[PDB]
C-alpha cells in the first residue's frame, strides 16, 4: 500500500533504533539518515492506519502560502498547532498579568490543577489575539516561521525575497533546473531561535512533465509528527504542480534524525498491527490556479477511510 | 566492498535514468532522490576501481577549513580545480588585454588553435595571482565559495558567522543535538551566482560516541564529480571526529539530481567491469588537533591501490 514506507520506517526505528537522549528529557530510539518516496499518482499519502486531521494540515499550509506569520488566521480556522509559541511571548512579557506559567509545558502534563489554569490564560490569549487588533499584532505575530522564510526572506540590504514565488517562476521558465531549492535555514537567526526549522529545505524536480519534490527534515517525531509532515509536503507538491500546469510525480522525504519517543512505543506497536486501506484522493479547484490565493474550499480530500485515531502523550 | 554503493548508483542511473536535458547543452540520464551510506570504520571511500587524486581533494578541503577564498593557496599546491571561476573575472574585466576568451569553455573543447591560446592566458593568469599580491587580491579572490559560507557567513548587520566553528563547539557541548547543521545556500546570493553551491548543506550526528555526517547534494555528476564529493565529505567527517575526540560513524550522501552525462557512457560501463579492491586507510596526525590549522602533511592515506585512471570529456 502507499503508506507502507512510513510503517517500514516505524519498524526500522523499533529494531535498529539506538536509545539516544533528547532535549525534552524524554528518551528516544533514533536513526540518522533515511529516505522514503511516495508516488503521488497512486494516491494521497494521508495515513489510513490512523486518523490524521487534514483540516489542520490544510489550513496551516495555506497560512504558509500566504506568507502569513500571525496566529490569528490559524485560530480563525480552529487551528491551535502554533498557539504555544505565541503564548510563550505573552507570558514572558512585562504587560502579562496572571498566574505563573513558568514551564507550562511539562508542568501541565503533570499537575491537573495547573493544567486547568493553563487552559484558561490560553483561552483568554486566543480571544484577545482574535478580537484585539493591536494585541494580535504584538503577540499574535511569530515573525520567523515558514511563511516568512518561504515568502519574505530578509536580505542584508533590508529587502525581502519571495523564495517560493521566485522558484515557481523558475519551474515555468526552466523546468529542467537543478537549482529549484527553497531553504528555511538561516544561519544568522538559528542560534536565537527556540525552534530552528525542522523542515530545513526542499527541492523541486521536473522530468517527463511530472513534478517531484524532495524534503530534507533534520529532526522528526516518527509517531506524532511524521504523519502530518508527509501530508503537508505531498499537498504542497500538488498545489505547485497545479499552478505550473504539471502532473505530479513523487514526494521524497529525507531524514536526518528520525526518532520515536519512549512513551509512543505501545501505540506505534498497535498501529503496526493494522492493515492499510486504499489511499484517499486529493481534488483541487480546476478554475483557480494562483495557489497563493487558495482557500480551504479549493482543496478537497475524497475517499479517506481511516482506522480510529491513536492518542499519545506529547514530549516536552 | 565499501565503494559498492557508488557502483550501484551508476548502474541505477544507467537502467532507470531518464534522459533529461542540461545547462551545458550536453545530455544526461538522471534520477531524483537517492541516498547511500559509507561505514567509515570499514575504510576510507576513495574509489579503487578508478584512480582519484587525493592530493586535490585534500588541499581543497583545507583551503575550505581555513575559510580561504583565494585561488592563490590552491595554485601553490598545484590545485587548479577553481582556476576557471577566477579566470573568468579576469577576462571580463576592463583591465584585461589579450585574445578574446568568450566562452573559452566549450570553445577550447572544440578548436585546438584556441585551446592553445587559452592555456596561455591562463598560464599567465596563474602566474600573476601567484606573484602579484594586488593582482591576487583582486582576481584571485572568489568571494562566495565554501570557505566563506562555512567560516564567514555574512549577516544583515554587517558581521560574519563562523558556522562550522560554532557547530564544532556544539558537538563538544551538546553531542545529542539535532541542530548540528551547516548550510551553504544563501537565498540572497544564489540568484546572482554563476554556480549556487552543489553541496547545499550537511548535518552531523552523534550516538554511542560515533560521529556521522549527512550531505545533501542538489546536483551531481555521477562520473567525474561524485568520486571526489565522497572523499571530501568522508574526509571532513574524519577531521571533525578527530577534533571532537570522537570515533567515526558513517557518511550518508543524499542526492537531489544525480546525473550521468551522455559522453560518459562507455567510460562508466568500463569502470563497472572492474572489481573493487580493499579500501585504503586514512591516518591523521595524533599530536595536532585544531583541524583549522591542519596542513597537507597532517593527513596521510595508507594502502590505496587503484585501477588506472579513466579519462573522460568534461561537459561545458
Ligand atoms: O511537524 C513537525 C514539527 C516538529 N517535529 C518534531 O519537534 C521536535 C523539535 O525539536 P528538535 O529536536 O528539532 O530540536 C522534534 O521531535 C521534531 C516533527 O516531527 N514534525
Ligand atoms: O564537485 C563537484 C562539483 C560539481 N558537480 C557538478 O557540476 C555541475 C554544476 O551545475 P548545475 O547543474 O548544478 O547547475 C553539475 O553537474 C554538478 C559535481 O558533481 N561535483
Ligand atoms: K540555507
Curated annotation (Swiss-Prot), chains A, B:
Q: How does it assemble?
A: Homodimer.
Quick one: which pathway?
Answer: Pyrimidine metabolism; dTTP biosynthesis
Task: Tell me the residue numbers annotated for binding (6R)-5,10-methylene-5,6,7,8-tetrahydrofolate.
Answer: 221, 315
Q: Where does the record place it?
A: Cytoplasm
Q: Where is the active site?
A: 198
Q: Which organism is it from?
A: Lacticaseibacillus casei
The record, for Gene3D superfamilies, names: Thymidylate synthase/dCMP hydroxymethylase domain
Can you say what this protein is called?
Thymidylate synthase
What is a single cellular component term in the Gene Ontology annotation? cytosol
For dUMP, which residues are the binding ones?
Answer: 23, 178-179, 218-221, 229, 259-261
A biological process term (GO) from this entry: dTMP biosynthetic process
Report the EC number(s), separated by commas if there are several.
Answer: 2.1.1.45
Does the keyword Cytoplasm feature in the UniProt annotation? Answer: yes
**Main localization of the protein described in the UniProt heading:** cytoplasm
Note the SUPFAM superfamilies from the entry. Thymidylate synthase/dCMP hydroxymethylase (SSF55831)
User: Which GO MF terms are attached to this record?
Assistant: thymidylate synthase activity
